[PDB]
Design a protein around this ligand. Structure first.
Ligand SMILES: OC[C@H]1O[C@H](Oc2c[nH]c3ccc(Br)c(Cl)c23)[C@@H](O)[C@@H](O)[C@@H]1O
Ligand SMILES: OC[C@H]1O[C@H](Oc2c[nH]c3ccc(Br)c(Cl)c23)[C@@H](O)[C@@H](O)[C@@H]1O
Ligand SMILES: OC[C@H]1O[C@H](Oc2c[nH]c3ccc(Br)c(Cl)c23)[C@@H](O)[C@@H](O)[C@@H]1O
Ligand SMILES: OC[C@H]1O[C@H](Oc2c[nH]c3ccc(Br)c(Cl)c23)[C@@H](O)[C@@H](O)[C@@H]1O
Ligand SMILES: OC[C@H]1O[C@H](Oc2c[nH]c3ccc(Br)c(Cl)c23)[C@@H](O)[C@@H](O)[C@@H]1O
Ligand SMILES: OC[C@H]1O[C@H](Oc2c[nH]c3ccc(Br)c(Cl)c23)[C@@H](O)[C@@H](O)[C@@H]1O
Lengths: 442, 442
């Protein structure tokens, strides 16, 4: 269920409305003359939304009807564009286009006397609409979810160059942003909630590195929702000149100096889970990956095992697909891949002289899906003595995998049903001290 | 979130629509002349639904606007009534009333040349609408949830007499219906999924007991959703003459003979969790309690303990409030009460010579709410030896209660977070062999 809200664009009059389709959106009905008088929708199984707007009593204000058909299932709605501006003294949607994987329908309505809006988005499917309406359509936005196996992406914003591409996604959340900036963004780097570090992207100029600044996000109160900033000329290059980091709680920034063309993205319900773009001497361009926060919550069970190691966690963006376990007489490390390409770091295995042997559990998701873990923990001795997970099995709705490592005296399991494992968490250092799961009903 | 759907009433033309309010419904706007051209809604924070219907191009067909205001928060919508019939050759909603805890608004529209509908409902709050619409409002129904601490109730249907009132609600599900019938319903009785028996309601006539019939519902495929039947004259008395039991899978019945006035209730998303009415020699009247099935699911953890005892389970209708535990050196029995008055049977304690001592855990719900259990199980000897829960504690978001009984060698717990316990299950006989929990995220 969870979706990201984009926009809306237009004026602030009218009453809030939303429509979340129960099946793919296959028709958009609008009433148009100079502006958008009204809008409604229809889904693949004939369900309709109400009509939003169109409340002008004046008859010469009804507007002409246009039906946009989406040739489902080979064509699907992915985005919109259009324009807002004044109409009879009200800030209102004036024109609209509907962007599909195959073509664009529109523009509909007047394309003058406006201010246009568009969305630098990828891997999205529009699963609903929202906006403001009164007599007319004051404002319009969309509800998006990722495409199967994908991740919603916005941007990148900035210049066109940068010899070094970068691109990563996290399985926890962004906790630290380290920026060197002055008037421009010289470089950027990020830390996981697990402490894993991404990049330095940029900062290759020996005679110009900029001034450091750090943003530290407390996961108990705050989470990265979005970014904004500015890009334009720096010493002859087109690069990012300022950035702000937007959370549910506040705006951190701006860093660098605001010059050139400013950018932002009006999203709600989003957790930034990564970044992509290009860099070189400086940060040429940057974009975000974003995931819907759920309405659901996840239950956390465990962890079981020793009480050393640094805390770590991994939640699938989609479905956990693959588990890599290094084992010998205990468990050295654990790693996860998911159906959307989200690959965890390796948790454990920090000691090159004790790495164990690689094992792979491959899960055909979603027909097969993880269901719980069981195993043992206890003493393990290399040079020193440790308390770690020593043996470990994984259960799915279809089968059991392992055991891996060696059984020891203290065993654990979870008599659990009607659930699926959506993620893992625990503690690791040289080995896998402790491990637990995140679950959801089904 | 889960709500019960009632209706809709009217014709089968138009397109399906629904509106689920995010805040209490405070306004209904209708366009009316002879029939209902169109409808829309507004909630406590200004959110609007779209307009449903009103698509006649003919301007002499727009209809007059009427605004029904709900004086929230002291007044709330509870039900509707109205009528459907023909209009320009289409089966359509013609009149409507809106029933509140304080008054009825309407009727609006024509009250002639229809067929009226009404709803014998109790303890409901309307949290949304659905229906069919095209040019006009072809059909309308409601979405309901129970009032705080209540249970939605329909009926009772039948005659006005019956010296013996009956009334019960189950914390699992209805598995067996035992009816004795010839031409009318002489008596009715029901079994829980736990095997607990309710009544015999009726059957007091020594010279007329009727013929037995049983309905056995398999919880793996099927669940009681609803009832229908007939009532009217039997040997001078006004009583229930036939009944059918409607599940998701089929209609079981009719039992007795269909004579007099027939009744039914068009509901979806419901689980029948009890019955109420009055009886004597025969079944004079019968009504149902229902609960919304969830969209959510519950995760089941455990049970822990011995492997004897009959399976039992209890799921709060609202919030678990009170736990009654009889203990001595092991656990004899367990029972539960919730904030809506749903009281479980006693699980365990079947032996009058070994009952232990009563204990009470009182939870102030919802500020305080159950979070998990822990304890021990092992041997306990009275005359024979048994393996049961021997000690038991309960954890809430605020505190821990117990231990009750006596610790023994095998202990259990659940390292769990971000959840609430919405119910219990296990096995019991003379004592509490085993116990587990149902959980949900939060
Ligand atoms: O859809 C645009 C407007 O619709 C309603 O506005 C009007 C109400 N009475 C009017 C008379 C005239 C003109 Br022009 C307008 Cl917009 C209105 C109200 O809902 C306004 O908030 C909203 O901005
Ligand atoms: O980040 C700004 C620019 O940095 C790099 O370009 C260079 C900038 N100053 C230099 C000096 C030397 C050499 Br060699 C190179 Cl590539 C550069 C390259 O990454 C460019 O594509 C990028 O646009
Ligand atoms: O992987 C498990 C261990 O790895 C890291 O610790 C150690 C590294 N080299 C060592 C040598 C000895 C002893 Br003793 C310990 Cl804990 C360590 C630390 O993270 C420990 O907390 C953790 O338990
Ligand atoms: O809501 C009533 C009707 O609206 C639409 O109907 C009509 C379409 N073209 C027409 C011409 C005339 C008359 Br009369 C009617 Cl109802 C229609 C369609 O959606 C019908 O399914 C629906 O029953
Ligand atoms: O069949 C339902 C009827 O059964 C009871 O009434 C009696 C029916 N036949 C009788 C014979 C005797 C005595 Br005494 C009584 Cl109460 C009755 C009473 O419970 C009536 O209120 C009820 O309507
Ligand atoms: O308290 C739980 C026990 O009570 C019931 O059994 C017994 C009743 N009287 C007995 C005497 C002896 C032995 Br041994 C047993 Cl299991 C019983 C049955 O429910 C058993 O399955 C259950 O383990």
């Amino acid at each position: 269920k969870g979706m990201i809200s984009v926009g809306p664009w237009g004026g602030s009059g009218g009453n809030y409305w939303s429509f979340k389709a129960n099946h793919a959106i296959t028709e958009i009905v609008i009433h148009v003359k100079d502006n958008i008088k009204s809008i409604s929708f229809k889904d693949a199984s004939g369900d309709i939304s109400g009509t939003f707007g169109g409340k002008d009593p004046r008859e010469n204000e009804k507007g002409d009807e246009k039906k946009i058909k989406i040739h489902w299932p080979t064509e699907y709605l992915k985005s919109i564009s259009g324009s807002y501006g004044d109409y009879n003294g009200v800030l209102v949607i004036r024109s609209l286009s509907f962007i599909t994987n195959l073509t664009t329908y529109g523009p509909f309505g007047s394309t003058s006397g406006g201010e246009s809006f568009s969305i630098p988005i990828a891997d999205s499917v529009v699963v609903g609409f929202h906006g403001r309406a009164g007599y007319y359509l004051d404002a319009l936005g969309i509800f998006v979810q990722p495409v199967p196996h994908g991740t919603i992406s916005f941007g990148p914003w900035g210049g066109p160059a940068g010899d070094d591409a970068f691109n990563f996604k996290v399985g926890s959340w962004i906790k630290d942003i380290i920026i060197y900036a002055d008037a421009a963004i010289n470089s950027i780097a990020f830390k996981d909630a697990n402490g894993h570090c991404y990049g330095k992207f940029g900062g290759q100029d020996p005679n110009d590195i900029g001034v450091e600044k750090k943003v530290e996000i407390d996961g108990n109160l705050e989470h990265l929702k979005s970014i904004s900033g500015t890009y334009g000329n720096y010493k002859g290059f087109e690069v990012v000149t300022s950035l702000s980091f937007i959370t549910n709680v506040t705006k951190h920034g701006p860093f660098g100096i605001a010059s050139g063309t400013s950018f932002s993205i009006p999203i709600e319900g989003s957790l930034v889970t990564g970044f992509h773009g290009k860099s070189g001497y400086y940060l040429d361009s940057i974009g975000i990956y974003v995931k819907p926060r759920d309405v659901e919550g996840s239950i956390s069970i465990g962890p079981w095992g020793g009480s050393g190691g640094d805390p770590w966690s991994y939640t699938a963006n989609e479905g956990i697909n693959q588990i890599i376990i290094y084992a010998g007489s205990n468990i050295k490390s654990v790693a996860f891949k998911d159906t959307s390409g989200l690959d965890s770091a390796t948790f454990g295995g920090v000691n090159p002289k004790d790495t164990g042997e690689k094992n792979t559990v491959s899960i055909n998701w979603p027909s097969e899906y993880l269901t719980s873990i069981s195993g043992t923990y206890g003493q393990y001795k290399f040079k020193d003595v440790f308390t770690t997970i020593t043996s470990l099995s994984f259960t799915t709705n279809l089968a059991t995998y392992g055991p891996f490592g060696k059984a020891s005296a203290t065993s654990f399991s979870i008599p659990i049903h009607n659930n699926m494992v959506v993620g893992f968490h625990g503690r690791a250092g040289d080995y896998l001290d402790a491990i637990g799961i995140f679950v959801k009903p089904d």
